[PDB]
Design a protein around this nucleic acid. Sequence first.
DNA 1: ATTATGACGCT
DNA 2: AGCGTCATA
Length: 430
Amino acid sequence: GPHMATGQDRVVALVDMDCFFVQVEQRQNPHLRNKPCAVVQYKSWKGGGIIAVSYEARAFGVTRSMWADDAKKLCPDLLLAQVRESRGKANLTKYREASVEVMEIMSRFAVIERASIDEAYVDLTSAVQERLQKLQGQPISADLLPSTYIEGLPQGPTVQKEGMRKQGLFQWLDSLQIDNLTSPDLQLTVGAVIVEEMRAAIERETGFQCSAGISHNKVLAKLACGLNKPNRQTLVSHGSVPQLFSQMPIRKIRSLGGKLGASVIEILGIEYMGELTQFTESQLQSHFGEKNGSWLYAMCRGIEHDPVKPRQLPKTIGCSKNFPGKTALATREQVQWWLLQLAQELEERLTKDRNDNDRVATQLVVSIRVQGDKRLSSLRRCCALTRYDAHKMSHDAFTVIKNCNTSGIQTEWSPPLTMLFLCATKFSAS
DNA sequence: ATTATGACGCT
DNA sequence: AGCGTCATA
Ligand SMILES: [Ca+2]
Ligand SMILES: [Mn+2]
């Protein structure tokens, strides 16, 4: 009891931009602001595929991975912004550059781990200790947490949402013991103060709104972030975990949304995260392996130790294109033309990366899919990447994959290719 | 005929 | 190394 770790040593936040590609387009085009709108890629096939949706549009049932023509059936007034096309393919440069804007602001506050194009983890443990010493055991005012929800509160002995938020925050702050600098609840609270400041800086300096979660580890921070979107932040305390997890579907936890999570549910005959506490660590290891079992055993108790890695930049730079249905590449020169298109975009991004970040990729990965296959990827081969030249890279890509062709005729390609992928990897300092 | 990515684990 | 899993706009 004295020695049982509680996984409360760190303060971790996850900051996630609201409807990110939509906000990027709304900043650019004021006519889209405060409207049901979505971002789409391509247009010919069923109006294009939606990849981001404003909250106004979500209210009509518009979702990601919906065709625009179908979204227009739910929301006739839906406004659409198209992803840029370059060299015959969608080009995401505008959103990658907006991502860098936000990541650079966050980095002023602390070490961040880039987790996607629109979100990053923050280890706030040191920043919190410093702010605590400035504070001199002075109470934290509700005024410093103007957009913060405390998960699980209010509780016990107003019908409007902002009213409930303040009720919960007051109960939380009323309870706090600001006298103890080592108190995990106090540490989370100060972490939340800092994240309010970070989110205010992001909005001031970019125009973009975001949500955030604050907790003691990455999984809880990610879960917290989702609880009160958009434009709000949520503090999930160690103490809030039993109630939170008691009705939390297992698939909601990061890494459990796929096959492993489905197996936890099936094998154990349970539905909610909290139900995992009734198994021994060895039981969980027996079913799910040493690593997953130990992870699950601690995670269902609110404990996880995965560090926030100090990495602000992506580890790989890749370019890919699908060729679905009848557009599949059936001739050699088709294949070679697109390999060149991909390689030209890759060269452009790599050259920019080398100048910005002082590094060079050393490996080129080539991937394809074949019609009827499998699997998102059918085949993956690597070769050396020694010069940032598209023509060399595309010639090299063709070399490592040309034996995939089962056509006796070398002018034809069989089976037709439904995907091409070029990825640069293994960066070295330059 | 969601598409275009990007990280990490297994063997 | 090559494959598979899981994730995000
Ligand atoms: Ca987001
Ligand atoms: Mn995200």
